[PDB]
Design a protein around this ligand. Structure first.
Ligand SMILES: *C(=C)C1=C(C)[C@@H](Cc2[nH]c(/C=C3N=C(/C=C4\NC(=O)[C@H](C)[C@H]4[C@@H](*)C)C(C)=C\3CCC(=O)O)c(CCC(=O)O)c2C)NC1=O
Ligand SMILES: *C(=C)C1=C(C)[C@@H](Cc2[nH]c(/C=C3N=C(/C=C4\NC(=O)[C@H](C)[C@H]4[C@@H](*)C)C(C)=C\3CCC(=O)O)c(CCC(=O)O)c2C)NC1=O
Ligand SMILES: *C(=C)C1=C(C)[C@@H](Cc2[nH]c(/C=C3N=C(/C=C4\NC(=O)[C@H](C)[C@H]4[C@@H](*)C)C(C)=C\3CCC(=O)O)c(CCC(=O)O)c2C)NC1=O
Ligand SMILES: *C(=C)C1=C(C)[C@@H](Cc2[nH]c(/C=C3N=C(/C=C4\NC(=O)[C@H](C)[C@H]4[C@@H](*)C)C(C)=C\3CCC(=O)O)c(CCC(=O)O)c2C)NC1=O
Ligand SMILES: *[C@@H](C)[C@H]1/C(=C/C2=NC(=C\c3[nH]c(C[C@H]4NC(=O)C(C=C)=C4C)c(C)c3CCC(=O)O)/C(CCC(=O)O)=C2C)NC(=O)[C@@H]1C
Ligand SMILES: *[C@@H](C)[C@H]1/C(=C/C2=NC(=C\c3[nH]c(C[C@H]4NC(=O)C(C=C)=C4C)c(C)c3CCC(=O)O)/C(CCC(=O)O)=C2C)NC(=O)[C@@H]1C
Ligand SMILES: *[C@@H](C)[C@H]1/C(=C/C2=NC(=C\c3[nH]c(C[C@H]4NC(=O)C(C=C)=C4C)c(C)c3CCC(=O)O)/C(CCC(=O)O)=C2C)NC(=O)[C@@H]1C
Ligand SMILES: *[C@@H](C)[C@H]1/C(=C/C2=NC(=C\c3[nH]c(C[C@H]4NC(=O)C(C=C)=C4C)c(C)c3CCC(=O)O)/C(CCC(=O)O)=C2C)NC(=O)[C@@H]1C
Ligand SMILES: *[C@H](C)[C@H]1/C(=C/C2=NC(=C\c3[nH]c(C[C@H]4NC(=O)C(C=C)=C4C)c(C)c3CCC(=O)O)/C(CCC(=O)O)=C2C)NC(=O)[C@@H]1C
Ligand SMILES: *[C@H](C)[C@H]1/C(=C/C2=NC(=C\c3[nH]c(C[C@H]4NC(=O)C(C=C)=C4C)c(C)c3CCC(=O)O)/C(CCC(=O)O)=C2C)NC(=O)[C@@H]1C
Ligand SMILES: *[C@H](C)[C@H]1/C(=C/C2=NC(=C\c3[nH]c(C[C@H]4NC(=O)C(C=C)=C4C)c(C)c3CCC(=O)O)/C(CCC(=O)O)=C2C)NC(=O)[C@@H]1C
Ligand SMILES: *[C@H](C)[C@H]1/C(=C/C2=NC(=C\c3[nH]c(C[C@H]4NC(=O)C(C=C)=C4C)c(C)c3CCC(=O)O)/C(CCC(=O)O)=C2C)NC(=O)[C@@H]1C
Ligand SMILES: *[C@H](C)[C@H]1/C(=C/C2=NC(=C\c3[nH]c(C[C@H]4NC(=O)C(C=C)=C4C)c(C)c3CCC(=O)O)/C(CCC(=O)O)=C2C)NC(=O)[C@@H]1C
Ligand SMILES: O=P([O-])([O-])O
Ligand SMILES: O=P([O-])([O-])O
Ligand SMILES: O=P([O-])([O-])O
Ligand SMILES: O=P([O-])([O-])O
Ligand SMILES: O=P([O-])([O-])O
Ligand SMILES: O=P([O-])([O-])O
Ligand SMILES: O=P([O-])([O-])O
Ligand SMILES: O=P([O-])([O-])O
Ligand code: NA
Ligand code: NA
Ligand code: NA
Ligand code: NA
Ligand code: NA
Lengths: 164, 184, 164, 184, 164, 184, 164, 184
């Protein structure tokens, strides 16, 4: 699971090395940046339902054709799954804020996503719009500090890039 | 591999739930500098630890260097020194990450079976590991003795607290104990 | 050359990744730890000759047989080389403090050292003793701060471990 | 590869000398947070940048998308998009490291000869790289325009200073210029 | 284990061949040379203790610093182990004379030697001097035939080369 | 692999002792020219031996060359011929070395399991090996018969002794028996 | 080209080894066996036309159908080429006796032979009979010593094996 | 690779002729024992030769061990020691075979071009090979000097003839000259 520490351990192990000076220095970066990313993680842990609900609503507002017969937001099951999927991305962003690398999002969100959505005929633009809404929505210090918001926004952009 | 933070995430993902407990995470961060000192204390002393541990295993069990012993001939001694270093290396990764998964996955899984196929003696492996555990504890606490240092004593110079990093000593020891459990 | 940033870049490149959260976090560690290691680097840059000179002196005091006819410190050229060698290690330590990883020592000191010394009949114990003397010599706050001295000592132990 | 600090060491080693000028190095550290912001600004906007740059190259040269053109048929368009991303990726590494060596060594060396053997047109390659250079400058300054953003505008929210990180803009632009230099 | 016959069998097997002319001819060389090498082996078998003792004594005479507190010949245990080690090399030489290839010395003496002596901070020069003494000591016809002595010396020089 | 001399050294090494008793070893040297003749006798006649042995196996069991038989169709007959030759080749290596290790390590290990998985019949394989054992005895003794030679008789012309190399015949035979036992 | 010395060199090179005891011992086998094989080589060099002629005559005697219309010995050009081919094998045997390994026969006779004879519809049995006649013809000490004859006969059987 | 005898066979095959001149080949055989002594003389002293030669090359050119020198830093010194040993190894193979083919084919072909691309200096490489040539000549003749032996003198003890193996010294020296000519 990609984080600061697992990246440097994997590099050390590939070379048969004990942890050395740059490995310790890297982990000091986690000590320093952790406050911002855990602040965002805590915000998101407390308010993920509302955050996901509004992002979902925004993507349907953008693309009302999804409500038409045969389309991906058209049935009660579909509506529930689409909201659930937005919440899954947010949860994986919460995890990635906890870890301080993209591992959770990479392994549990991104890997396979394109194949799944192609198979099920799910368009990617609504996913992008939900995440895009969420990315443009936050402001500091209203919602969280400026650096917490930097961390949150970076993970949303990471997700957006993976679907673009 | 996982680390202490991704461990919490995997536990939460098992119930597709957010990680709610920030306090435990913040405590990892608060002891981060002491953790880096603990890792520095082992890594900095690794050659001395390995050589002393293997030599101690041998002085307590002279069969190892006598006819048919598993540290005879030179090639076997050298393989043993290499192994003790490998084990210490993966224990130190586990301490840096705050999680045993790198040690389980990349070192311990299959190792008891590998050693049984080679005939590497379990009691001696365990003893080398026990010696390294005791060394690690002393270097983390920055209280090695002259009596065990063989004129090679090192002082780390980390800032002293009354408990001398008891929690990290217990955690490091738990990783050595995991090795011992897996290999016996 | 191994440092915080080249390690993360190499790991990113192996996976075809742009820099991501854990890469930036790792580099923040360099920002943080730089003061300590650069303090040590400055001290060593300003006093390298005296530091090497006394460490060299200590290894010959330990091993006076090196002066006896035929041995590795016994002539004027040999004497100069041995002091020079000690200074090379301290210069590579200075470089490693600047970089924040062990690259300079690995690439320009450690690689090949055992084969060179073997071929030339040069015993390794006196190298170890010079570095050992240097490792035990410093104290804080006299020579530098406690964390500068931690950086300095860790690289000396890195070099000692390479020769042990 | 090198970084800005090992680059200084290589220069010192040319005269077997210690690194004595701590000045320029302490400047790298002082601008370290800005540098992280600059990297974030590019990486965070990379898909939009690549797509827009390749589309711009094409709207300025319609021959690329007609029979015989090097972005025809779909396979070639795809390969071009991939290359523009690759180039931007290695530029971003150079900016993180504060040194061009990873870009030069891993992306640029042999690129001219590779493209010449394939018939990839230099003129158009240059335009794609120029557009990315301009995009990068705007994102580092956090001054992208609505006019160029095609409904996809992003603001970074970094702490504003009057020069809008002019030295980092210049450095980033120098790396894009190296890409272009490597084609001739 | 490397010998005349295992070398030719390995080469034949790699090519899917029965033994052929050149394989048989090689083994004729063992029939011819065995007299010299087995003579040397029998001499060495019958007098190994005295031969190793004088080699050990020579290496300590060259390096009296080994007797000093903390050095490798400074305790009764260490003195016994050093003599033992010299005897091990002579025993492996005896085995190599029996086999007629360097297999026993390569596999049981040389492999790992550098790593062992490094880890224990044992200097290699005393091993080299013991073997060197042994190499310069014999003369023919006093000790054995001139061709026997050639065989014995060649294996001592093979061991010296491995440590040099 | 080991040979007769390295086998003796492995014995001595088990007690960390010099090789003192050289009588058996000096006998190997005294019989070395006859061992080379024994090897030459088999290698020089190997194509005749293999073809005649597989043909004998078959003439004694026509099921092998009928529907469902393990030397039917041509590819199976060819594979059988190839195997008989492989076996004979490794037996000759064992005879040259004076030690079965090459045969055990490089031929016999896993052979039973291989044949089981393929359905190669043990009874028939053993008979082929038994025929080759008899052939090799007669060629080592340099007493093949016209009756069994099918117009292809060869005489080796080695210097005759009364026992006709009985010791080497017994040793060769023991290697063929080892092949058979590996299928038991 | 396979010989005693090239086989041991190739094995030493694959392992990065200088020549060692077993390599020298193998070459002493060539010093010893060379008398026998160079005796056979000398006799064959001096009498190759007669040796080849009678071997060729024997193969046609065994297979008189080869003289019939359309068969492989039926024209003057075919007759000349068949005898020439017998002589080529004998010359390669002569070379193999000089080298002390099968190299010249392997590389210049055996390699390709089956493909060539198949393409031209030439039967192999007459080749085997020529070589077989040659193999059964010699006697010692009339033609050469018993050990020279053993070398000659072994190469003839090696050639027969390659065609059988 | 070829040896002295297969070289003669190649020459004979160029006119599809038997090898008729047995004399030069019977001279090879007569000098075989001395050839094995000559190879033993070099192999047995190889470490001392290589280290002394490379040290000699350096003491005559101190530029090699200064900044920018091709034996600086440790890695380059090691690579150079490795190469001198490789070269000597291949020369010794050629002397054992009595033919330069192994040396030309496996060591010298492409070597000058390799060194040019790396910037390995020619004059210095030649010097190291010159010193090894001179050492080899002394060890073959069994007349090394105390002056040059640095307290590591070895005597081979081979049976002395008045010419001290003049032909083999010329031959060995010719192989070293081949190396030097290929690198010049
Ligand atoms: C054989 C006669 C024999 C030994 C060899 C020795 C092995 C041994 N060592 C310990 C404990 C430690 N060894 C330490 C090592 C070092 N300390 C240093 O300062 C340097 C860097 C390094 C290498 C020499 C350390 C730190 C300890 C911990 C205890 C302490 O410092 O006081 C033990 C005890 C192990 C245990 O408790 O189970 C043993 C057995 N002993 C021998 O008998
Ligand atoms: C074809 C008709 C054609 C185009 C396609 C387009 C290409 C083009 N783009 C620019 C400049 C920029 N594009 C930018 C991209 C983005 N901004 C954002 O906010 C999102 C994240 C992203 C993707 C849309 C940016 C930042 C710029 C920089 C300038 C600015 O922001 O105002 C150019 C100009 C390049 C140059 O200066 O040489 C071109 C040509 N133009 C077309 O004509
Ligand atoms: C099928 C009708 C059938 C056979 C085919 C044949 C098989 C068989 N062969 C032997 C014994 C030998 N065969 C030998 C082979 C050869 N002798 C030579 O001179 C040439 C070079 C070579 C190939 C033809 C030899 C040497 C023997 C040994 C005995 C001897 O020489 O007298 C046997 C007997 C096996 C046994 O004893 O168990 C058999 C069965 N027999 C068939 O019935
Ligand atoms: C540096 C100042 C410097 C040198 C280092 C040295 C280099 C050098 N060496 C020789 C000649 C030989 N060296 C030999 C080596 C050895 N002899 C032994 O007995 C042992 C086993 C071995 C290792 C020490 C030998 C045999 C010689 C041959 C000459 C001799 O024996 O007298 C030379 C001379 C080369 C030549 O003749 O062209 C040089 C330059 N000299 C330095 O100045
Ligand atoms: C048990 C491990 C020790 C011990 C350790 C303590 N270290 C403390 C502080 C500290 N350590 C470092 C160095 C560390 N941080 C890094 O970034 C790197 C390398 C990149 C390393 C090696 C720093 C920077 C600090 C903080 C500065 C300071 O306090 O001086 C520390 C105090 C904080 C705390 O209570 O956790 C402790 C206790 N202490 C002991 O008693 C044993 C010997
Ligand atoms: C040009 C690039 C920008 C700009 C950038 C500035 N950033 C400044 C401060 C700052 N940035 C960060 C985030 C950065 N550090 C990290 O650790 C990580 C990720 C791990 C990132 C992305 C931090 C933490 C800080 C310091 C805190 C703060 O000041 O709020 C900054 C001010 C300091 C300086 O002058 O260098 C600037 C100028 N500014 C601009 O005008 C353009 C748009
Ligand atoms: C059972 C195997 C035989 C038999 C064999 C004997 N061979 C004897 C002598 C002998 N054989 C060779 C040839 C051999 N040596 C080589 O170097 C090579 C190839 C490179 C081969 C093939 C030699 C040189 C000699 C020695 C000279 C001589 O004796 O003429 C031999 C006599 C010595 C002894 O008793 O061991 C025997 C008995 N004898 C038999 O009766 C069966 C058929
Ligand atoms: C120049 C190279 C020397 C020198 C050499 C001579 N060696 C002579 C004889 C000889 N050498 C050996 C050992 C050799 N043969 C082997 O089988 C092996 C290893 C397997 C080796 C190392 C033997 C067995 C013999 C024959 C016995 C003997 O003569 O004592 C030799 C004399 C014969 C000849 O003239 O060719 C010479 C001259 N002599 C010199 O002057 C320089 C130093
Ligand atoms: C800065 C003043 C902005 C801006 C911000 C507004 N946000 C408003 C409501 C709102 N925002 C969120 C997302 C936020 N909550 C979180 O928990 C997280 C991340 C974990 C984020 C980023 C939510 C769920 C809500 C609704 C609940 C609430 O009021 O907090 C808001 C109120 C009016 C509105 O809903 O638009 C404002 C004003 N508004 C701006 O125009 C500037 C650019
Ligand atoms: C702590 C008070 C120690 C202690 C320290 C002493 N060190 C003394 C001299 C000394 N130390 C060094 C090494 C130092 N200089 C550097 O530039 C660097 C690193 C870049 C280091 C680690 C040198 C070269 C010298 C000699 C020059 C000088 O005096 O500064 C010293 C003076 C007396 C002496 O030489 O021993 C002391 C007191 N002494 C102690 O007792 C505690 C444990
Ligand atoms: C001092 C603690 C020693 C000692 C040392 C001597 N070293 C000798 C030669 C030598 N040293 C090195 C390593 C050095 N060169 C580098 O480029 C670097 C790192 C960048 C280092 C650390 C090399 C490569 C060499 C060989 C080339 C040369 O001569 O410079 C030396 C001369 C040995 C000889 O010529 O025989 C000595 C005496 N002497 C002592 O007493 C202790 C063991
Ligand atoms: C040739 C005349 C030499 C020389 C030789 C001397 N050796 C003496 C004693 C001696 N040598 C050995 C080693 C020898 N014994 C073995 O078993 C083996 C190999 C297996 C070898 C090489 C031993 C153990 C001894 C002591 C017992 C004994 O006397 O045999 C010797 C006696 C005086 C002394 O001890 O130095 C001589 C004269 N001396 C020379 O000066 C020329 C060059
Ligand atoms: C042993 C006494 C045999 C036997 C042998 C005879 N061979 C006869 C003639 C003959 N042999 C060869 C082949 C021979 N010459 C060579 O140069 C070489 C190898 C290089 C060999 C193997 C030739 C070419 C000839 C014809 C020329 C000649 O007379 O030498 C021979 C004469 C009568 C005949 O032609 O058959 C005999 C007696 N004869 C026997 O009865 C026993 C078993
Ligand atoms: O993984 P993906 O499916 O390619 O997104
Ligand atoms: O990464 P991992 O799977 O833990 O080894
Ligand atoms: O690299 P090294 O030489 O092994 O130290
Ligand atoms: O590491 P690099 O060489 O830069 O790729
Ligand atoms: O094996 P080594 O360790 O390299 O001697
Ligand atoms: O060599 P090996 O192990 O017998 O196969
Ligand atoms: O090579 P070959 O054709 O198979 O004979
Ligand atoms: O074998 P070679 O071809 O000479 O490498
Ligand atoms: Na993308
Ligand atoms: Na267990
Ligand atoms: Na070490
Ligand atoms: Na060596
Ligand atoms: Na065949």
């Amino acid at each position: 699971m990609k984080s600061v520490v697992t990246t440097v351990i994997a590099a050390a192990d590939a070379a048969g090395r004990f942890p050395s000076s740059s490995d310790l220095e890297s982990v000091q970066g986690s000590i320093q940046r952790s406050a911002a990313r855990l602040e965002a993680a805590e915000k998101l842990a407390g308010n993920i339902d509302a955050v996901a609900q509004e992002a979902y609503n925004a993507c349907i507002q953008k693309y009302p054709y999804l409500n038409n017969s045969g389309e991906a937001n058209s049935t009660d099951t579909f509506k529930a799954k689409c909201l659930r999927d937005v919440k899954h991305y947010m949860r994986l962003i919460q995890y990635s804020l906890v870890v301080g690398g993209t591992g959770p999002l990479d392994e549990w969100g991104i890997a396979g996503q394109r194949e799944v959505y192609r198979a099920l005929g799910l368009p990617t633009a609504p996913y992008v719009e939900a995440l895009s809404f969420a990315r443009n929505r936050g402001c500091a210090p209203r919602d969280m500090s400026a650096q917490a918001l930097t961390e949150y926004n970076a993970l949303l952009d990471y997700a957006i890039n993976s679907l673009s | 591999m996982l680390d202490a933070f991704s461990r919490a995430v995997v536990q939460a993902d098992a119930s597709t739930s957010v990680v709610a407990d920030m306090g435990a995470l913040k405590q990892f961060i608060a002891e981060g500098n002491r953790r880096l000192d603990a890792v520095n204390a082992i890594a900095s002393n690794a050659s001395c630890m390995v050589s002393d541990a293997v030599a101690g295993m041998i002085c307590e069990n002279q069969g190892l260097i006598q006819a048919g012993g598993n540290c005879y001939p030179n090639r076997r001694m050298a393989a043993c020194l290499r192994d003790a270093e490998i084990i210490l290396r993966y224990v130190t990764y586990a301490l840096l990450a705050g999680d045993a998964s790198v040690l389980d996955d990349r070192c311990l899984n299959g190792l008891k079976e590998t050693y049984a196929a080679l005939g590497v003696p379990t009691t001696s492996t365990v003893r080398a590991v026990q010696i390294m555990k005791a060394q690690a504890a002393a270097h983390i606490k920055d209280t090695p003795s002259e009596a065990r240092a063989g004129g090679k004593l090192r002082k780390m110079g980390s800032p002293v607290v009354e408990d001398r990093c008891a929690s990290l000593v217990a955690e490091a020891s738990s990783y050595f104990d995991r090795v011992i459990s897996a290999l016996s």
